[PDB]
Amino acid sequence: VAQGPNGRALAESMNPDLLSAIQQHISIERYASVTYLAMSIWCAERELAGFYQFFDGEAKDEQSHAVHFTQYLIARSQSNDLQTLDAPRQNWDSLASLMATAFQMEADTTSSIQSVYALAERNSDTRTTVFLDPLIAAQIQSEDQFAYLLGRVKFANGDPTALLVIDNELRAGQTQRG
């Protein structure tokens, strides 16, 4: 029985480029987390309490996703390498603009997973593609959700009355098409 790079018994070696890609992706999830925290603060600063609560939860969830990936590296007997985290964007001119950055951040998180997926397929790493499959499934739902929130906010067309209504929807937990 061989030892993997993190010292645990090794079920199958992992290509170093794939390892690097996963470690990088963990940073993407952590960065999405602190981005959503920054968005939650921006909303709180403007009394958009429902949007604040929503993004506060998204920040915690994105962190959980990151930890989920660190557990996979542990399971694969690979080393983690927690990286420097950039500061998030913190200023937007409107809620519509914030929600556009949010949607983009969610789509970019999926693209990151997609590139890890493609690398695993090139390396015939079926453990990794299997591991990623439900995460892609969840990304589809999150993209659908953020397209919903963005589109609803854009429909409001900057009217504070409509934005207050949507804010109250979010506070109530009405955050998807259902």
Residue 121 annotated as binding site? no
Is residue 72 close enough to count as binding Fe ion by CB under 5 A? no
C-alpha neighbours within 13 Å on the C-beta side of residue 82: 7
Is-contact 112 25, C-beta < 8 A? yes
94: contact with its own copies by CB under 8 A: no
Site mask for Cl ion (CB under 5 A), range 69-88, x = bound? --------------------
Asked if residue 95 binds Cl ion (CB under 5 A), the reply is yes
Is 174 a binding residue for Cl ion by CB under 5 A? The answer is no
Q: End-to-end distance of the chain based on CA atoms, in angstroms? A: 49
Among 90, 94, 126, 176, binds Cl ion (CB under 5 A): 94
Q: Check: CB of residue 29 under 8 Å from CB of residue 66.
A: yes
Structure tokens at 133: 């499959």
Sites for its own copies among residues 61-90 (CB under 8 A): 63, 67, 70-72, 74-77, 80-88, 90
φ, ψ for residue 3, nearest 5 deg: -95, 140
29 counts as binding its own copies under rule CB under 8 A:
no
- CA–CA gap between residue 106 and residue 146 (Å, rounded): 8
- Is residue 117 near its own copies by the rule CB under 8 A? yes
Going by the annotation, the residues of the binding site for Fe(3+) are 29, 62, 65, 106, 133
